[PDB]
From a paper:
Macrodomains are ubiquitous and evolutionarily conserved modules (approx. 130–190 residues) that recognize ADPr derivatives in their free form or linked to proteins, including ADPr, PAR, ADP-ribose-1″phosphate and O-acetyl-ADPr (OAADPr). To expand our knowledge concerning the field of macrodomains, we have characterized Oceanobacillus iheyensis macrodomain (OiMacroD), the first to be described from the order Bacillales. A yield of 40 mg of pure protein per litre of culture after a simple two-step purification process was obtained. Its phylogenetic analysis revealed that, among the six different classes previously described for macrodomains, OiMacroD is included in the MacroD-type clade, together with other previously characterized MacroD-like macrodomains, such as hMacroD1 and hMacroD2. The subunit has a mixed α/β fold, similar to that of other nucleotide-binding proteins, composed of a central seven-stranded mixed β-sheet (β1–β2–β7–β6–β3–β5–β4) and five α-helices.
Since this water molecule is also present in the OiMacroD-ADPr structure (W6) with a good B-factor value, where it interacts with the Pα and the distal ribose through the 1″-OH and ether O atom, an OiMacroD G37V mutant was designed to study its role. The structural analysis of G37V, which contains an ADPr molecule bound, revealed a lack of ED for W6 because the substrate-coordinated water molecule is absent, unlike in the OiMacroD-ADPr complex. This absence does not hamper ADPr binding or cause any perturbation in the protein structure. As expected, the valine side chain is located close enough to the water molecule position to disturb its coordination with the ADPr molecule. However, this slight perturbation reduced the kcat of the G37V mutant fourfold, to reach a value similar to that found in D40A, pointing to a possible catalytic role. Interestingly, although the Km remained unaffected, some extra positive ED is seen to surround the pyrophosphate and especially the distal ribose, reflecting some uncertainty in the position of the atoms. As a consequence of the disorder found in the distal ribose of the G37V mutant, both D40 rotamers were present, supporting the role of this residue in the structural organization of the β3–α1 loop. Hence, W6 seems to be important for the substrate to acquire the correct conformation, favouring the proper alignment of the reactive groups and leading to OAADPr deacetylation. In particular, mutant G37V revealed a significant reduction in ADPr release, which supports the role of W6 not just in OAADPr deacetylation, but also in the removal of ADPr from MARylated proteins.
Author numbering: -1 to 184
Write the structure that this text describes.
């Protein structure tokens, strides 16, 4: 299952798939602030990338983040190592309902900051997972709306290239498909 849409010279695609098997130059990891290994998409990414990824992320923690956590909504970039994709942009989504009045803004920041980095570094293509909707508990209907709104607005105003949202389930995909149809019509 897949749906594609042109936004100026950019393309947005939603697809069912495994983000560790993508053809985009960049994939996004829904990471934790400590840049340590976890479960879910982060776990799959570390497994597929191999053990150099954790080592590189810890070097980034200690050398660029002065030994501290990556803040919610912010991004760093590493190699993809054994992944097919060449780079991983790691971001930290909000933990649902910890900070309800800021969480929509912070989730949007994950998308905007990743896309800005792709734009400025001319990285051409990028896949996102469904950030915050696993261990971090964010309802998929609300998250999908924020993700798509943020991505679409960015692609209306900026030259980026190809953006995919890669969903691990038909259910998550079907929710994205409904929202995208609504935003494309509206
Ligand atoms: N291989 C995959 N390809 C594409 N999407 C995937 C894949 N595997 C899972 N997903 C989807 O990816 C989405 C995100 O679910 P979560 O992976 O839990 O991310 P979070 O931001 O909520 O939690 C980050 C925390 O969990 C980690 O331990 C971190 O280390 C942190 O502790 C869901 O739709 C998944 O079904």
């Amino acid at each position: 299952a897949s749906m594609k849409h042109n936004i100026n010279d950019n393309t947005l695609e939603i697809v069912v798939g495994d983000i560790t098997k993508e053809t985009t130059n960049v994939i996004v990891n829904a990471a934790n602030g400590s840049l340590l290994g976890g479960v879910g998409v982060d776990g799959a990414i570390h497994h597929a990338a191999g053990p150099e990824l954790l080592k590189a992320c810890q070097e980034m923690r200690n050398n660029e983040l002065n030994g501290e956590e990556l803040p919610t909504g912010e991004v760093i970039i590493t190699s993809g190592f054994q992944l097919p994709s060449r780079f991983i942009i790691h971001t930290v989504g909000p933990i649902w309902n910890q900070t309800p009045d800021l969480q929509e803004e912070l989730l949007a920041n994950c998308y905007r900051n990743a896309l800005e980095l792709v734009k400025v570094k001319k990285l051409s293509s990028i896949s996102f997972p469904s950030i915050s909707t696993g261990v971090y508990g964010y309802p998929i209907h609300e998250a999908a709306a924020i993700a798509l709104q943020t991505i679409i607005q960015f692609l209306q105003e900026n030259d980026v290239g190809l953006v995919k949202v890669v969903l691990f389930s038909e259910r998550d995909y079907s929710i994205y498909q409904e929202k995208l149809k609504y935003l494309i019509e509206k």
